[PDB]
Design a protein around this ligand. Sequence first.
Ligand SMILES: [Zn+2]
Ligand SMILES: [Zn+2]
Ligand SMILES: [Zn+2]
Ligand SMILES: [Zn+2]
Ligand SMILES: [Zn+2]
Ligand SMILES: [Zn+2]
Lengths: 140, 142
Amino acid sequence: PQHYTYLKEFRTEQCPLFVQHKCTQHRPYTCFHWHFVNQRRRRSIRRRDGTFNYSPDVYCTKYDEATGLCPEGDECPFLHRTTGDTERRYHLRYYKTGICIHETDSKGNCTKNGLHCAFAHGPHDLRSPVYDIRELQAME
Amino acid sequence: PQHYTYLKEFRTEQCPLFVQHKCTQHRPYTCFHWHFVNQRRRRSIRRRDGTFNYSPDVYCTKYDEATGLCPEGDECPFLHRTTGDTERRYHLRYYKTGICIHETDSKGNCTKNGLHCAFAHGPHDLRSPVYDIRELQAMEAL
RNA sequence: UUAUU
Ligand SMILES: [Zn+2]
Ligand SMILES: [Zn+2]
Ligand SMILES: [Zn+2]
Ligand SMILES: [Zn+2]
Ligand SMILES: [Zn+2]
Ligand SMILES: [Zn+2]
């Protein structure tokens, strides 16, 4: 059940090893957790009213990619282009919904995008998109 | 599988619903999260040197069971008698290492402790203990 | 494809 943990937790909290100068995954940057705020991801959520807490498609124009700060903060309804575009790649709408074009290795992981590839490697690894009620209503 | 989620997470964080009287899993207290501080457990951890962050056997005498406070907090090397004895029961050393004496119901859950039961129901549900390097030494000598 | 541009 790795999908749940990535959707809920990927890059949402700071790496405790990094603050102790002990994270081996800073360069190149491959950690599960954020090291700087400009690498922080907001958990993507579908609210009870059927809307996403933020869009899977429209990028915020005020988000400061260098500092990880948006004037509207986390309540911003638009997508933030954080490091590695992880708000989009790990969004309920898109995470693991397409097939990865890259080969799969013997442990079932991506040969090119590393352990955190957000494309699917095999049927067990594919999920159906979750849609905003507004996308569903457009699809009609 | 579900073992890792219990080991790492069970009753380690405060329930955001309970603080608002919106948790429906209080009495019968089936919530995965703590509601009162004395229900909170610290995640047990095997350090790189092979020792546990805190013992699964020797109980802290400073831990106030009424308030859930120990002066050493997460760094106390001794076991806290949290409500339901959850630090011991969900410890790496003991969680699901033995068979529950109680029976399972028709959903696959313990009849006395429900789905959260810390003993294994069926040999398929067993895990091997994780041992402190010290216990490994004493055990080998037998 | 949400990392095939
Ligand atoms: Zn790290
Ligand atoms: Zn924004
Ligand atoms: Zn891939
Ligand atoms: Zn609760
Ligand atoms: Zn203590
Ligand atoms: Zn039981």
